[PDB]
Structures are given as structure tokens and as C-alpha cells.
Amino acid sequence: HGEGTFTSDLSKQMEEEAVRLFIEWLKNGGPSSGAPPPS
Q1: Is 35 exposed, middle or buried, given 0-12, 13-18 or 19+ CB atoms closer than 10 A?
Q2: What are the Serine amide sites (modified residues) in this protein?
Q3: Contact partners, residue 37, CB within 8 Å, separation at least 6
Q4: Alpha helices, DSSP H only, in the chain?
């Protein structure tokens, strides 16, 4: 329609979300927890 500069920030946010999952995975025990890494 006109303006829409959201994809720029959305692309970065997507990468940040992956970090949160990885962080949570390490908190539960990481490799020595039982479940695989969130990648």
C-alpha cells in the first residue's frame, strides 16, 4: 500500500528468538540434559 519497514526488524528478531531457545536449552542442562539443541 505505502510504507512498511517491519521486515527489517523482523529479520533480526527471528535470530534473537533462536538465542532465547538455545539459552533455555543450556539452562535445563544443555547437551547433558537428554533433548537435542534448539537449532
Answers
A1: exposed
A2: 39
A3: 22, 25, 30, 31
A4: 7-27
